[PDB]
Write a protein that binds this ligand. Structure first.
Ligand SMILES: CCCCCCCCCCCCCCCCCCCC
Ligand SMILES: CCCCCCCCCCCCCCCCCCCC
Ligand SMILES: CCCCCCCCCCCCCCCCCCCC
Ligand SMILES: [Fe+3]
Ligand SMILES: [Fe+3]
Ligand SMILES: [Fe+3]
Ligand SMILES: [Fe+3]
Ligand SMILES: [Fe+3]
Ligand SMILES: [Fe+3]
Lengths: 164, 164, 164, 164, 164, 164
């Protein structure tokens, strides 16, 4: 039987679906970059999309480990175009900060319910979000320095296209 | 410039989104098998979901190679429950036969337009569909022979849980 | 259930039986070459007979993959006497060209029915028949040049006897 | 020149053709097992068909070694269906016992003619027939013990499917 | 004797000669890049010329495999001057798209004649042309982004000069 | 700036174009040998065609090293048929002797102009032409000894077909 509350189960399932959307949004940013011919930025976003799916499956396996079940929900259509390289990465940063706040909300729900197992499980994501946000902020700072000069933006398309 | 027609680009983009849905459907079947305690069947379905993502990305890269762009659409909520193991695999077979017909329709459209590049590209998917349909039919035949015997269902769950 | 039509299943089953006969014909050619004391030509024909069985089994496995069944039919007695070495290889070429036309007829039937899976499956055989015909044409050209000279025919016997 | 009698040559050639039919019969049993969805039993029968061809070719090479020639005859249509797994293997046992008696008849004929070379050649087949018959009896014993339990028949299908 | 029609043989021979011209055109592009001091772009074009010769020899061997013969025709003088790097690669792209259409025309002729062997042979070039066009489009996108900045064009010259 | 005279540059460019024609001529001889069924002689001629391209590219790189430019000219249609194997190799010998005299004419022009760099560059070709002529003379001597004797011509075809 399920040892998380239905309310914590719902919060975790909601977050799983949010991570699925995150993966889909980053794939959409990849489609935009590929349409604009930045094959390295697109590669970076495809890798990010794969990473978000691993987040979703961590939520999946935790839900089942606590006796719950996962219900997949409809996936909203992501935006398909951005008003520039900066516009896309600013959207990514805004999205990741929203994901961080969502995880925070689950953590406090679990803590109020004295569900220490879920509180502890979420630590990994708190720490991971620190890094996700930082990587996007670093990219945005580089884009600010480039100031639209393609001499430099070529170098950064090439470097992010190196992501493993 | 785009060297596929807009109608062929649309058909290919539609199929990419269909493959994304397929992946999500197989993930949902995994949520069902895991809820029912069949971790080997669930494992098989997670592997199948990943395979469907590789199909989607094959369409993605071909579309860009012909000068088109991809637009991701909303993904419909899949079913979450089946009336038993057979019911789920029968749903999988019906879905794969629908995917095959979808591929056939693109092939016939591209052939009507004398788009030999797209006709040739689609051959890989025709052959792959033969294999996917056959593997599900094989599982259904084994389940029919098992006739609900848990000894045999345990053995098959093991076997499918070994999928690489 | 069977997802090829009965007319296509019958065409494929007919061709499987045709490939069995091909194997048997080449074994009969081996009996002739061995009776004439050309063990290298006989070796080549025994290898060709084994190759034809691999063709039959490719049809076999495709038929089952599409939900059909194979029915083996009577095997006609092959000829056992030829006028000479070149006449045997000329008969081989005529047989392979007949096999190619038989395959073409299946492809055109499948295409009429929009059975794209079977059309795609048969491509391997179209390409292979090009090679089968060409290898016999090459041997026939060498035998025409030899012009019955037993010195040269012995060299060709030793060379064909090296077939792997 | 031929140093076997024509009667012994005919007996050996008749047996070569019997071995060709044996191979074809076992391939037909494979068509039945594959239609019934027992891919391991079918695999065993495909291996047996290849073994029977090695028997035919041992007769072939001996006939030529004694200065005779081989004449291939029409091959009769084998049965395509059996009333079940045990029915098919009972047919296989009856066939192999008929093959053994046929070999015995050649041996007795050659002995009457004081053709010691052929009597000695046939000892390999006498000994091999002991093993062929015994392997079928062992499978029939296993099927008798299984008594139609699919739990056990799955085991036997996988075990026979491991045949090298 | 020839098993392609004279019309299909002439279409294939015409294409072989077109592939020879393609090779010569790319060598001429190398003469331009070397005159402009871009040794890496020139290296890329020398490698491309060699690849075009392999295309010509594939047509050569297929014509002979179907019993035809090759007749080499005069090769027209290629252009030797372009208005810049991007202009040369735009010419390469236009040339490759013309080559693709030429191949399509042969494919449609062969299909009209039910020459399934030749249609199938041409599939390889259909797929290869997809790749050739895409590789030139990728180079054109890089040159577009470079926007005449010699900093980037030096790097691109080195990179293309590494072609194996 | 160009440090060869225009007259020497034109002589070298003319010779580069002559070497291209040489390559094409030897490919045409290959088309003849393949039409006649002598795949070893054809192989030898294909290897010779590639060797002539290496000659052309040695002229190419020297022209650029001295500040000149290469202009590729139209290639004349080579003969496609010869009155036999010996006729083809006699034509090859006559061609190579013509090439040697052409190189000599460049050397004498450069010496008149005291262009010691070009005189020295051409020594490699003087020495190479000695070998080019000698290998064809050797083949012609073998063919004279063979005297149309097909037994011997087979041996010569296989030997020339081993060319690396
Ligand atoms: C290389 C880009 C990968 C594609 C990312 C797609 C993002 C949206 C996909 C929707 C979800 C589909 C189901 C995926 C389940 C994966 C489960 C296996 C373990 C990761
Ligand atoms: C040493 C060379 C051996 C050549 C043997 C070729 C025999 C050809 C006879 C064909 C007709 C009988 C076919 C029987 C079925 C064989 C199935 C084998 C694959 C499983
Ligand atoms: C770096 C080398 C570049 C050389 C390109 C030359 C293209 C000129 C075309 C002329 C054709 C001559 C015949 C060549 C036949 C070669 C056949 C064998 C090799 C595939
Ligand atoms: Fe995430
Ligand atoms: Fe798929
Ligand atoms: Fe065949
Ligand atoms: Fe036997
Ligand atoms: Fe090409
Ligand atoms: Fe030369």
């Amino acid at each position: 039987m399920m040892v998380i509350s239905e309310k914590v189960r719902k919060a975790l399932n909601d977050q799983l679906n949010r991570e699925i959307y995150s993966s889909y949004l980053y794939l959409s940013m990849a489609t935009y970059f590929d349409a604009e011919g930045f094959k390295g930025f697109a590669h970076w976003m495809k890798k990010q999309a794969q990473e978000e799916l691993t987040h979703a499956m961590k939520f999946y396996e935790y839900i089942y480990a606590r006796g719950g079940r996962v219900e997949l929900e409809a996936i909203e259509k992501p935006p398909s175009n951005w008003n520039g390289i900066k516009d896309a990465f600013e959207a990514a940063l805004k999205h990741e900060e929203f994901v961080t706040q969502s995880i925070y909300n689950i953590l406090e729900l679990a803590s109020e319910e004295k569900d220490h197992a879920t509180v502890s499980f979420l630590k990994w994501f708190v720490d991971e979000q620190v890094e996700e946000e930082d990587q996007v902020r670093e990219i945005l700072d580089l884009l600010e320095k480039a100031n639209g000069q393609m001499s430099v933006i070529f170098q950064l398309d090439r470097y992010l296209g190196q992501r493993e």
